[PDB]
Design a binder for this molecule. Structure first.
Ligand SMILES: [Co+2]
Ligand SMILES: [Co+2]
Lengths: 48, 48
């Protein structure tokens, strides 16, 4: 594929984590970290 | 690609975060999250 949709979502969530910290919303940071974790599982597949 | 040496380091650090959490070492989780953050900046060539 040429869209790299998951890489784009990862980049966005990364940015959103810094923004939530800057807003004083560490609660939102936690949820976004969980979201980033899931995306990393989708993107970085464990493989032989 | 997702199989580069850098991707392997990301996979490793990700696993180490789970292990540190299991050990109750949230201090180590934080340091490892900072390391993951840097690797993601390298891999996705993102700036803050
Ligand atoms: Co995981
Ligand atoms: Co960053």
């Amino acid at each position: 594929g040429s869209g790299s949709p998951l890489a784009q979502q990862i980049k966005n969530i990364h940015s959103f984590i810094h923004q939530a910290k800057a807003a004083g919303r560490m609660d939102e940071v936690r949820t976004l970290q969980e979201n980033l974790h899931q995306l990393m599982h989708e993107y970085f597949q464990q493989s032989d």
